[PDB]
């Protein structure tokens, strides 16, 4: 629908870390939405960006991408140290149905919780 | 971890379609894993690939890629019609701890089910 406050739940190993996000509006330079983490001073918070494109002269197929990145600084004011980039991009043809899109979305969402990927993400162990 | 035969249940708009994946080895040419679903011909098989890159001096950063690409066929013999490319790429640093990676992965996984993204992926309506 529109941009409303999103309250994530049970995030992390223990599931005791909860994240609340308030929309920060959509910029008009290139039409990407944005979110932010409530509370803490800006430039020191989680960022979530969602964008939906349209067919172009060069890119006929659709393109929806989600970019998420968050820096964790260390100790007058905290200074950013390093970031953890993470982006997700899809691609659909104009003739594609809703069933296939939903199937891909939920399949990848479930795959991000597999033992294989939980081992391949938290630790750095290549699949072998 | 060994690339065991993963399977997916209660997947879809109504959570009814299920799929089974069998491993198809790992190729040393670029160090990427692979997964696939058993099918009549390789062309129509749903494919899932995961990989992690050694942070060489040219890049000095970690990368994790997950590429999901499944086609569909329509009817002598079926042929591929349209693709459903869907890739996921990560990035980290040498000194990044486990907490940040766990937080990023878990929030991405939980946000994929958030109603905003549910609406965005389905009807492709911009936020």
């Amino acid at each position, epitope marked *: 629908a529109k941009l409303e406050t999103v309250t994530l*739940g*049970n*995030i992390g*190993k*223990d*599931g005791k870390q*909860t994240l609340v996000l308030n929309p920060r509006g959509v910029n008009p330079t290139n039409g990407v939405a944005s979110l932010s983490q409530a509370g803490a001073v800006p430039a020191l918070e989680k960022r979530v960006t969602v964008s939906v494109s349209q067919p172009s002269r060069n890119r006929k197929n659709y393109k929806v991408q989600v970019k998420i990145q968050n820096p964790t600084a260390c100790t007058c004011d905290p200074s950013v140290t390093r970031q953890a980039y993470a982006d997700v991009t899809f691609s659909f043809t104009q003739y594609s149905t809703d069933e296939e899109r939903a199937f891909v979305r939920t399949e990848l969402a*479930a*795959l991000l*919780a*597999s*033992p294989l990927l939980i081992d391949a993400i938290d630790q750095l162990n290549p699949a072998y | *971890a*060994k690339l*065991e*035969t*993963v*399977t*997916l*249940g*209660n997947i879809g708009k*109504d*959570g009814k379609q*299920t799929l*089974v994946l*069998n491993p198809r080895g790992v190729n040393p040419t670029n160090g990427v894993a692979s997964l696939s679903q058993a099918g009549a011909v390789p062309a129509l098989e749903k494919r899932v690939t995961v990989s992690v890159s050694q942070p060489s001096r040219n890049r000095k950063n970690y990368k994790v890629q997950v590429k999901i690409q499944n086609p569909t066929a329509c009817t002598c013999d079926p042929s591929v019609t349209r693709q459903a490319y869907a890739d996921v790429t990560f990035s980290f640093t040498q000194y990044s701890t486990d907490e940040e990676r766990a937080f990023v992965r*878990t929030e991405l996984a*939980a946000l994929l089910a958030s109603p905003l993204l549910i609406d965005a992926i389905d009807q492709l309506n911009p936020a």
Partner: antibody
Amino acid sequence: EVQLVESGGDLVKPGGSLKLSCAASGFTFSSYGMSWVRQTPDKRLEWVATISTGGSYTDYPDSVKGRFTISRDNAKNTLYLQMSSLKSEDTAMYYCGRTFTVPYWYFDVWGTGTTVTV
Amino acid sequence: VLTQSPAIMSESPGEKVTMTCSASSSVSYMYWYQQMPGSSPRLLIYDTSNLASGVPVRFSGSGSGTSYSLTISRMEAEDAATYYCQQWSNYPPLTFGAGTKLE
């Protein structure tokens, strides 16, 4: 789909040393996740000894960790649970379960269950 | 990690009947099973929103922060014995809940 769990588990002294077995009649057992349901005799039930497909990743609750071991083979469609040693507790009839590999939480249709007492 | 439900409710055939469960925490999902008086409990709803796997339409449930509905349809002939509960808090140790009886 007809899960069979017919095994031993007759009453034994508090020393364990017994094995539980399961079998699938027409079910495809090659690529699926299994689990065990410890149902207390009166009302409750708890979760214990769940493994994933491929016999590579296992898990246990933090109550019997390091005391219960699961061995599974793809041949003859069987799985084995090792009952090492009891504490005079857990004298309750057991259930075997089926699950997909990465909705490993929540189980699915399961057959009857056997009993074990100490 | 801790769940509870009201127990021992008697209900004549027809009209409405309901039974809920407590949370005592924040849970992403809240599933439950139906156990026949003999043996072999089955599955139903399993997603707090999806109808069921084998139960024919009548049984339904709705989700919230703590309450989880589990609203039985206007007909409940037989449908006896125990309805359990189960949650998945996105970290391993499963909990389940105490049983309940019907008539």
